[PDB]
Amino acid sequence: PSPNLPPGFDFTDPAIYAERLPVAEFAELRSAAPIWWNGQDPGKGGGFHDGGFWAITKLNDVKEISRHSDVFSSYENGVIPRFKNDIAREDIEVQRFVMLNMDAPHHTRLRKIISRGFTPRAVGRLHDELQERAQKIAAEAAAAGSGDFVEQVSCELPLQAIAGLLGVPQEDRGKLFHWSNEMTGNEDPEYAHIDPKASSAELIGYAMKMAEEKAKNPADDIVTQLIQADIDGEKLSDDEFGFFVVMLAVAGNETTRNSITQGMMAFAEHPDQWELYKKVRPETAADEIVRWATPVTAFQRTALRDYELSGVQIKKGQRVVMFYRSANFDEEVFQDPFTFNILRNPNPHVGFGGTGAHYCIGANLARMTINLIFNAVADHMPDLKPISAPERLRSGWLNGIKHWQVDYTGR
Ligand code: HEM
Ligand SMILES: NCc1ccc(-c2csnn2)cc1
Ligand SMILES: [Cl-]
Ligand SMILES: [Cl-]
Ligand SMILES: [Cl-]
């Protein structure tokens, strides 16, 4: 029995996400076709011209794909499953220069370097400054009375986390934030004029100058650990540091922003969870917010060989698309997946991906950012109330909120 979906439905269609999350449609796949061939008409594959892909909807299959990175490649077609239909193949392949789109052994070496400086100690060293910034953000928003929660609450702390991790001078954070924002959303009419390639090139140029500067003056950041040779002489070259900065700018900005916006949307819809949060301030809330928000709807892989997955024969060369938005509501893993429960524990969501080689290196920085901003929201605008419905982002793989009008003082 085929799944009850409209003919030609494409779960990476940006026109869907501009209006809604296809929650009923994912639930139908989980019940009737948990691994399902998503066909794509000629020229309508978002930059891929292979006839379609396997939709992966169950959490255990997402973990299996993610852990078998020897078979399911990030490099072969990159991990973003949807671009503009007319994107040039060369513009997909240039994305192989960021760690996200690399396979072992190249990925292994680069991740080892990135992780010697990107440690729990390094992240914890940002706690106090990000806490001060979160309190300032929430106080200034509340002072405004009403406004766009996305812009006045959600946007700034994730960017300041990237700046503090890298030790970016305060005078440069404006342009750093500009470049980061220019590298996502280009399929939405509101952002039709951004140029992510041009922005990435400007950020690489900036980052390579940073690498040369911070080599002369080591400072209390991660850059020095990254650009300094270890025992084996392993280190990021200046251009590798540049591609890492591009990586961070695109990985840790709008993802965390959208988790914050949709976290507060969830609190607005579940007042009892908001009351509980304000009283207990449970840090388990961050993981339930990421599960609920699933800011990356999906990443893909490409089979390097034939592989049988939960009884379905994946063929060499075929793409599999891991729908984290479906897996995070998998009835076989979660008790009451469609209950927003900030005390959920353990919370084995895959909002940060399936376990394995590419697991989000910023997961704990993201959780800390979320916990700090929601404490600040609780401290300064405990009675906020939405004014109008969120405006969603036209994207085929990112779950974004562009704007959300709220009354911070609660009438
Ligand atoms: C709630 C916010 C975030 C979400 C939902 C998220 C999600 C993800 C996902 C789904 C992946 C791919 C994992 C996989 O394929 O197995 C990933 C990888 C990555 N994330 Fe995050 N992320 C978030 C925040 C951040 C932040 C704040 C940073 C750094 C400041 C960051 C840096 C990275 C990097 C560098 C990678 C690539 C790791 C690799 O390929 O080895 N992310 N993230
Ligand atoms: N942290 C998850 C994440 C990683 C890379 C991207 C991204 C956006 S454009 N190229 N890569 C977005 C989100
Ligand atoms: Cl293709
Ligand atoms: Cl088109
Ligand atoms: Cl659960």
Q: Under DSSP, is residue 42 helix (H, G, I), strand (E, B) or coil?
A: coil
Residue closest by Cα to atom 8 of ligand 2: 250
Closest ligand to Cα 159? 1
Ligand 1 contacts CB of residue 81 (under 6 A): no
Spatial separation of the C-alpha atoms in residues 381 and 361, rounded to whole Å: 31
Mutate to test the pocket of ligand 1, among 101, 299, 360, 398 (most ligand atoms within 8 A of CB): 360
How far is CA 275 from each of CA 229, 271, 278, 369, rounded to the nearest angstrom? Answer: 50, 6, 5, 20
Spatial separation of the C-alpha atoms in residues 5 and 408, rounded to whole Å: 40
What determination technique applies here? Answer: X-ray
Kindly list the protein residues that place their beta carbon closer than 5 angstroms to ligand 5, a single-atom ion: 334-335
Q: Which structural domains are found in the chain, ordered by start?
A: 14-407 (1.10.630.10)
Spatial separation of the C-alpha atoms in residues 115 and 133, rounded to whole Å: 25
How do strand 52-56 and strand 35-39 relate by DSSP bridges?
antiparallel
Q: Quick one: CA dihedral 363, 365, 368, 373, positive or negative? A: negative
User: Separation of 93 CA from ligand 1 center, angstroms?
Assistant: 20
Ligand 1 contacts CB of residue 290 (under 6 A): yes
User: Separation of 187 CA from ligand 4 center, angstroms?
Assistant: 10
Closest ligand to Cα 251? 2
> Which atom of ligand 2 lies nearest, measured to the CA of 360?
1
Residue closest by Cα to atom 10 of ligand 2: 250
Ligand 2 contacts CB of residue 255 (under 6 A): yes
> Which atom of ligand 1 lies nearest, measured to the CA of 110?
41
Ligand 1 contacts CB of residue 365 (under 6 A): yes
Spatial separation of the C-alpha atoms in residues 233 and 115, rounded to whole Å: 16
Please, where are the H alpha helices in 118-184? 120-124, 127-143, 149, 156-166, 173-181
Give resolution, Å, one decimal.
1.9
Ligand 1 contacts CB of residue 351 (under 6 A): yes
Residue closest by Cα to atom 25 of ligand 1: 252
User: Separation of 14 CA from ligand 4 center, angstroms?
Assistant: 10
DSSP, res 281: -
155 is in an annotated binding site: no
- Quote the strand ranges of 267-387, DSSP E: 298-303, 307-309, 312-314, 319-323, 385-386
Ligand 1 contacts CB of residue 360 (under 6 A): yes
Q: How large is the C-alpha radius of gyration of the chain?
A: 21
User: Separation of 328 CA from ligand 5 center, angstroms?
Assistant: 10
Ligand 2 contacts CB of residue 375 (under 6 A): no
User: CB–CB of 26/326 below 8 Å?
Assistant: yes
User: CB–CB of 32/67 below 8 Å?
Assistant: no
The residues that bridge with 322 in the sheet, in sequence order, are 56, 299
User: CB–CB of 48/86 below 8 Å?
Assistant: no
